[PDB]
């Protein structure tokens, strides 16, 4: 409790100034002697959790990406989250995705964000908060999407979903209803006011419950591509979504549309 509290205090000793000198980490902690502060900073620096910037007549301490997530783990110790860390499935551009587990033993997904001194951390924070709010907007509207657990300042911990992408999915039996689904869902996107331009094969994720009841769903992860309908180029974005669905269903599922697909002028009488 206590060491994590003092590490939270020097976390709160970051939102005061720029690159923090040694005596501010001495005094913001407010600890007893030279021992705790100096040996803690040395434990940080040897684990690369802190770095020394010595700009003339001026010692200072430079926090890298390492010595933050513990506090996030402490922030997630508060919010009942992950206990065990590490299984690499997917190293993305603006996040690194890991498979983790709680005290309860259910596996979850840990997207750490790495987008120094304040701005790498803070822009990872803005990215995590923005994606968490977009996930909140999608789940509040009712879109079938993974359920968010938390957004530990810059690391998003969410659920794991049993799905595999459509590139390894040959076909299903109810192909025209799947086409009506992947038309009406982009219709629902235009009724939300947004167009997800990367509506590709690798986006769409299908969970598979049974083979008799047919009670399943979908997962759509296109977050840095959703564009409002008011922008300059949304017409052929919508048409690229529709036509990628149609060209995939012609190439893979060998299905041509008997009803005509919706245009942007069709969906202008929507939202």
Judged by CB under 7 A, the stretch of 12-20, 136-144, 178-186, 256-264 that binds RNA is 12-20
| Residue from 62, 53, 25 nearest 40 by CA | 25
CA-to-CA distance for 243 and 253, rounded, in angstroms?
14
CA-to-CA distance for 235 and 270, rounded, in angstroms?
14
Is residue 111 part of an annotated ligand binding site? yes
Contact 7/74 with Cβ under 8 angstroms? yes
Which is catalytic among the residues 96, 102, 188, 198? 198
In angstroms, what is the minimal distance from the CB of 220 to RNA? 13
- Give the three-class secondary structure for 81: coil
**Taking CB under 7 A as the rule, does residue 251 contact RNA?**
yes
CA-to-CA distance for 231 and 252, rounded, in angstroms?
32
**Taking CB under 7 A as the rule, does residue 58 contact RNA?**
yes
Residues 6+ apart with CB under 8 A from 147: 139, 158, 159
Residue 95 is given by DSSP the state -
The token pair that represents 12 in the structure block = 């709160």
CB of 192 or CB of 200, closer to RNA: 200
**Taking CB under 7 A as the rule, does residue 12 contact RNA?**
yes
**Taking CB under 7 A as the rule, does residue 200 contact RNA?**
yes
In angstroms, what is the minimal distance from the CB of 59 to RNA? 11
Please confirm, yes or no, whether 198 is among the known catalytic residues.
yes
CA-to-CA distance for 50 and 104, rounded, in angstroms?
32
**Taking CB under 7 A as the rule, does residue 87 contact RNA?**
yes
CA-to-CA distance for 7 and 154, rounded, in angstroms?
17
In angstroms, what is the minimal distance from the CB of 192 to RNA? 20
CB of 17 or CB of 209, closer to RNA: 17
User: Which residue from 30, 46, 86, 211 is in contact with RNA, where contact means CB under 7 A?
Assistant: 86
In angstroms, what is the minimal distance from the CB of 77 to RNA? 10
**Taking CB under 7 A as the rule, does residue 133 contact RNA?**
no
Judged by CB under 7 A, the stretch of 81-89, 127-135, 139-147, 210-218 that binds RNA is 81-89
**Taking CB under 7 A as the rule, does residue 15 contact RNA?**
yes
**HSE (side-chain half, CA atoms, 13 Å) at 15:** 6
In angstroms, what is the minimal distance from the CB of 212 to RNA? 27
**Taking CB under 7 A as the rule, does residue 48 contact RNA?**
no
Judged by CB under 7 A, the stretch of 13-21, 41-49, 143-151, 176-184 that binds RNA is 13-21
The token pair that represents 35 in the structure block = 């021992």
DSSP letters, 139-167, are HHHT---PPEEEEETTEEEEE---EEEGG
Residues that bind RNA (CB under 7 A): 5, 8, 12, 15-18, 33-35, 55, 57-58, 78, 86-88, 93, 167-168, 198, 200, 202, 224-225, 251-252
Q: Which residues are catalytic?
A: 198
């Amino acid at each position: 409790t206590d060491d994590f509290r003092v590490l939270q205090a020097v976390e709160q000793g970051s939102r005061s100034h720029e690159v923090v000198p040694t005596p501010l980490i001495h005094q913001i902690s407010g600890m007893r002697s030279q021992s705790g502060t100096n040996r803690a900073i040395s434990d940080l620096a040897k684990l690369s959790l802190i770095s020394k910037m010595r700009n003339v007549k001026y010692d200072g301490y430079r926090l890298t990406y390492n010595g933050i997530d513990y506090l996030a783990l402490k922030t997630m110790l508060n919010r009942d989250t992950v206990y065990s860390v590490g299984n690499t499935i997917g190293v993305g551009k603006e996040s690194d995705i890991y498979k983790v587990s709680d005290k309860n033993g259910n596996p979850r997904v840990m997207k750490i964000h790495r987008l120094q001194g304040a701005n790498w951390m803070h822009l990872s924070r803005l990215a995590a908060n923005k994606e968490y709010q977009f996930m909140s907007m999608l789940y509040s509207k009712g879109f079938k999407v993974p359920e968010p657990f938390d957004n530990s300042r810059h690391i998003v911990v969410m659920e794991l979903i049993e799905g595999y992408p459509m590139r390894r999915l040959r076909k299903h039996k109810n192909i025209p209803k799947l086409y009506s689904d992947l038309m009406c869902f982009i219709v629902d996107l235009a009724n939300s006011g947004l167009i997800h331009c990367d509506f590709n094969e690798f986006n769409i994720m299908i969970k598979d419950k049974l083979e008799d009841e047919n009670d399943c769903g979908f997962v759509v992860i296109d977050f840095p591509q959703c564009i409002s309908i008011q922008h300059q180029d949304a017409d052929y974005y919508f048409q690229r979504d529709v036509d990628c669905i149609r060209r995939f269903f012609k190439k893979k599922l060998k299905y041509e549309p008997k009803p005509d697909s919706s245009m942007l002028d069709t969906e202008g009488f929507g939202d």
